[PDB]
Design brief:
The structure holds 42 chains of a larger assembly. Chain A is mainly beta. Chain A is about 0% helix and about 60% strand. The first copy, chain A, is rod-shaped and about 15 Å long. Chain A starts with a strand and ends with a strand. Chains A and N meet through strand 1 of A and strand 1 of N. The complex binds 2,2'-[thiophene-2,5-diyldi(4,1-phenylene)]diacetic acid (27 copies). The PDB classes it as protein fibril. Keywords: peptide fiber, helical polymer, protein fibril. Cryo-EM of pi-conjugated Peptide 2 (9 strands).
C-alpha cells in the first residue's frame, strides 16, 4: 500500500 | 494497496 | 487504497 | 480510499 | 473516500 | 479504491 | 472510492 | 465517493 | 458523495 | 486497489 | 478518504 | 493491488 | 485512503 | 492506501 | 500484487 | 501491494 | 508484493 | 507493498 | 515478492 | 514487496 | 521480495 | 460519446 | 466512445 | 472505443 | 479497442 | 471510433 | 465517435 | 469513427 | 475505426 | 477502432 | 481498425 | 483495431 | 485490441 | 487490424 | 490488430 | 493483422 | 491483440 | 496480429 | 499475421 | 497476439 | 502473427 | 505468420 514515485 | 496507472 | 489514474 | 482521475 | 475527477 | 474503466 | 467510467 | 460517468 | 454524469 | 480496465 | 493535491 | 487489463 | 500528489 | 507522487 | 493482462 | 502500471 | 509494469 | 521509483 | 516487467 | 528502481 | 535496479 | 477523465 | 484516463 | 491509462 | 497502460 | 491520441 | 485527443 | 486529419 | 492521418 | 497513439 | 497514416 | 504505438 | 504495459 | 503506414 | 510498436 | 509498413 | 510488457 | 516491434 | 515491411 | 517481456 | 522484433 | 521483409 505504498508507491512513492 | 498502491495502484498507479 | 491509493488509486491514481 | 484515495481516487484520483 | 476521496474522489477527484 | 475501485475504478471501472 | 469507486468510479464508474 | 462514487462517480457514475 | 455520488455524481450521476 | 482494484482497477477494471 | 484523503486526497491532497 | 489487482489490475484487470 | 491517501493520495498526495 | 498510500501513493505520494 | 496481481496483474491480469 | 505496490502496483505501478 | 512489488509489481511494476 | 512498496514500490519507490 | 518483487515483480518487475 | 519491495521494488526500488 | 527485493528487486533494486 | 467519449468520456474524458 | 473512447475513455481517456 | 479505446481506453487510455 | 486498445488499452494503453 | 477512430482515436487520434 | 471520432476522437481527436 | 473515422478521422480525416 | 479508420484514421486517415 | 484505429488508434494513433 | 485500419490506419492510413 | 490498428494500433500505431 | 492490444494492451500496452 | 491493418496499418497502411 | 496490426500493432506498430 | 497485416502491417503494410 | 498483442500485449507489450 | 502483425506486430512490428 | 503478415508483415509487408 | 505476441507478448513482449 | 508475424513478429518483426 | 509470414514476414515479407
Ligand atoms: C492491531 O491493531 C495492530 C495492527 C497491525 C497492522 C494492521 C495493518 C493492516 C493492514 C496494513 C498495511 C496496509 C498497507 C501496507 C502497504 C502496502 O501493502 C502495509 C500494511 S497494517 C492493523 C492493525
Ligand atoms: C484489527 O484491528 C486488526 C485489523 C488489521 C487490519 C485490518 C484491515 C482491513 C482492511 C485493510 C486494508 C484495506 C485496504 C488496503 C489498501 C490496499 O491494500 C490495505 C489494507 S487492513 C482490519 C483489522
Ligand atoms: C476495528 O477497529 C478494527 C478495524 C480495522 C480496520 C477496519 C477497516 C475497514 C475498512 C478499511 C479500509 C477501507 C478502505 C481503505 C482504502 C483502500 O484500501 C482502506 C481500509 S479498514 C475496520 C475495523
Ligand atoms: C469501530 O469503530 C471500528 C470501525 C473501523 C472502521 C470502520 C469503517 C467503515 C468504513 C470505512 C471506510 C470507508 C471509506 C473509506 C474510503 C476509501 O476506502 C475508508 C474507510 S472505515 C468502522 C468501524
Ligand atoms: C461507531 O462509531 C463506529 C463507526 C465507525 C465508522 C462508521 C462509518 C460509517 C460510514 C463511514 C464513511 C462514509 C463515507 C466515507 C467517505 C469515503 O469513503 C468514509 C467513511 S465511517 C460508523 C460507525
Ligand atoms: C469509534 O468511535 C472509533 C472510530 C474509529 C474510526 C472510525 C472511522 C470510520 C471511517 C474512517 C476513515 C474514513 C476515511 C479515511 C481516509 C480515506 O480512506 C480514513 C478513515 S475512521 C470511526 C470511529
Ligand atoms: C477503533 O476505534 C480503532 C480504529 C482503528 C482504525 C480504524 C480505521 C478504519 C479505516 C481506516 C483507514 C482508512 C483509510 C486509510 C488510508 C487508505 O487506505 C487508512 C486507514 S482506519 C477505525 C477505528
Ligand atoms: C484497532 O483499533 C487498531 C487498528 C489497526 C489498524 C487498522 C487499519 C485498518 C486499515 C489500515 C490501512 C489502510 C491503508 C493503508 C495504506 C494502503 O494500504 C495501510 C493500513 S490500518 C485499524 C485499527
Ligand atoms: C491483526 O492485527 C493482524 C493483522 C495483520 C494484517 C492484517 C492485514 C489484512 C490485509 C492486509 C493488506 C491488505 C492490502 C495490502 C496491499 C497490497 O498487498 C497489504 C496488506 S494486512 C490484518 C490483521
Ligand atoms: C499477525 O499480526 C501476523 C500476520 C502477519 C502477516 C499478515 C499479512 C497478511 C497479508 C499480508 C500481505 C498482503 C499483501 C502484501 C503485498 C504483496 O505481497 C504483502 C503482505 S501480510 C497478517 C498477520
Ligand atoms: C506471524 O507474524 C508470522 C508470519 C510471517 C509471515 C507472514 C506472511 C504472510 C504473507 C507474506 C508475504 C506476502 C506477500 C509477499 C510479497 C512477495 O512475496 C511477501 C510475503 S509474509 C505471516 C505471519
Ligand atoms: C507480528 O506482529 C510480527 C510480524 C512479522 C512480520 C509480518 C509480515 C507480514 C508480511 C511481511 C512482508 C511483506 C512484504 C515484504 C517485501 C516483499 O516481499 C516483506 C515482508 S512482514 C507481520 C507481523
Ligand atoms: C515474527 O513476527 C517474525 C517474522 C519473521 C519474518 C517474517 C517474514 C515474512 C515474509 C518475509 C519476507 C518477505 C519478502 C522478502 C524479500 C523477497 O523474498 C523476504 C522476507 S519476512 C515475519 C515475521
Ligand atoms: C450483437 O452482438 C449486437 C452488437 C454488435 C456489436 C455491437 C458494438 C458495440 C460497439 C461497437 C464498436 C464501437 C466502436 C468501434 C470502433 C470505432 O468506430 C467498433 C465497434 S460494435 C453492439 C451490439
Ligand atoms: C444490438 O446490439 C443493437 C445495438 C448495436 C450497436 C449499438 C451501439 C452503441 C454504440 C455504438 C457506437 C458508438 C460510437 C462508435 C464510434 C463513433 O462513432 C461506434 C459504435 S454502436 C447499440 C445497439
Ligand atoms: C449485429 O451484430 C449486426 C451489427 C454489426 C455492427 C454493428 C456496429 C456497431 C457500431 C459500428 C460502427 C460505428 C462506427 C464506425 C466507424 C466510425 O464512425 C464503424 C462501425 S457497427 C451493429 C450491429
Ligand atoms: C455477428 O457477430 C455479426 C457482426 C460482425 C461484426 C460486428 C462488428 C462490430 C464492430 C465492427 C467495426 C466497427 C468499426 C470498424 C472500422 C472503424 O470504423 C470495423 C468494424 S463490426 C458486429 C456483428
Ligand atoms: C456476437 O459475437 C455478436 C458480436 C460480435 C462482435 C462484437 C464486437 C464488439 C466490439 C468489436 C470491435 C470494436 C473495435 C474494433 C476495431 C476498431 O474499429 C473491432 C471490433 S466487435 C459484438 C458482438
Ligand atoms: C461470428 O463469429 C462471425 C463474426 C466474425 C467477425 C466479427 C468481427 C468483430 C470485429 C471485427 C473487425 C472490426 C474491425 C476490423 C478492421 C478495423 O476497422 C476488422 C474486423 S469482425 C464478428 C462476427
Ligand atoms: C463468436 O465468437 C462471435 C464473436 C466473434 C468475434 C468477436 C470479436 C470481438 C472483438 C474482435 C476484434 C477486435 C479487434 C480486432 C483487430 C482490430 O480491428 C480484431 C477482432 S472479434 C466477438 C464475437
Ligand atoms: C467462427 O469462429 C468464425 C469467425 C472467424 C473469425 C472471426 C474474427 C474475429 C476477428 C477477426 C479480424 C478482425 C480484424 C482483422 C484485420 C484487422 O482489421 C482480421 C480479423 S476475424 C470471427 C468469427
Ligand atoms: C469461436 O471461436 C468464435 C470466435 C472465433 C474467433 C474469435 C476472435 C477473437 C479475437 C480475434 C482476433 C483479434 C485480433 C486479431 C489480429 C488483429 O486484427 C486476430 C484475431 S478472433 C472470437 C470468437
Ligand atoms: C473455427 O475455428 C474456424 C475459425 C478459423 C479462424 C478464425 C480466426 C480468428 C482470427 C483470425 C485472423 C484475424 C486476423 C488475421 C490477419 C490480421 O488482420 C488473420 C486471422 S482467423 C476463427 C474461426
Ligand atoms: C475454435 O477453436 C474456434 C476458434 C479458433 C481460433 C480462435 C482464435 C483466437 C485468436 C486467433 C488469432 C489471433 C491473432 C492471430 C495473428 C494476428 O493476426 C492469429 C490468430 S485465432 C478462436 C476460436
Ligand atoms: C480447426 O482447428 C480449424 C481452424 C484452423 C485454423 C484456425 C486459425 C486460427 C488462427 C489462424 C491465423 C490467423 C492469422 C494468420 C496470418 C496472420 O494474419 C494465419 C492463421 S488460422 C482456426 C480454426
Ligand atoms: C481446435 O484446435 C480449434 C483451434 C485451432 C487453432 C487455434 C489457434 C489459436 C491461435 C492460433 C495461431 C495464432 C497465431 C499464429 C501465427 C500468427 O499469425 C498461428 C496460429 S491457431 C484455436 C482453436
Ligand atoms: C486440426 O488440427 C486441423 C487444424 C490444422 C491447423 C490449424 C492451424 C492453427 C494455426 C495455423 C497457422 C496460422 C498461421 C500460419 C502462417 C502465419 O500467418 C500458418 C498456420 S494452422 C488448425 C487446425
Amino acid at each position: 500500500g505504498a508507491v512513492e514515485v
